[PDB]
Amino acid sequence: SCIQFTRHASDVLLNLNRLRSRDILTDVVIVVSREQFRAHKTVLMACSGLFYSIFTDQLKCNLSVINLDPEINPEGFCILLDFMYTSRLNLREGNIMAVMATAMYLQMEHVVDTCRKFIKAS
Amino acid sequence: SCIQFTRHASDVLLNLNRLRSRDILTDVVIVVSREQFRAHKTVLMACSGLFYSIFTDQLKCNLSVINLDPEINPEGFCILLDFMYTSRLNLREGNIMAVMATAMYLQMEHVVDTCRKFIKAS
């Protein structure tokens, strides 16, 4: 018999993104080639099958630095990290291949699905 | 020119609640009288003006235990912690007064607003 506040989840994600922009309570650095991205482990796990697996591992859960596979493109990662914290995906002709490959590696099934749809259309 | 995934924020909150239920990456214990509640500091901050203030404080941000005011009712807190992680509020005739008082203390303005509306109706 609960009542529900429609905008609650969106408002929570918006505040988590504000904490990220101000580098508040970030507890991990994701290294992608020469580039570094600060984030919250819980948000990464909630969005990605790969980070979920990494941070539930009894040894990796305690790492402050995670290095991604050298094939991962920093821009594709940046676009996906922004999507994790906003629900908005900056999908463009020039980045779609790198975004799909990064989403497949990160195990972000809904992003992979829309990339496959957008590629098929063109 | 971004695209948006409508269910993303809700899916993120659902996974954060699953992490809470399994006690994964919880980094704080909230003590309310004899009762203890494990949670994620970032989620508490995203939902509550009080926790936002506590965990942005250069000294309190590092505490693993937070003790609430002894007037706070553990059931009212439990109902509000559930709302933080689900968007669902278990508001009942028998708990509305304790929920409103706890929401005022935690600075959860939308919960305070619905409690004032439900009380006014009766």
Partner: peptide
């Protein structure tokens, strides 16, 4: 607020 809604009835979910």
């Amino acid at each position: 607020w809604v009835i979910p």
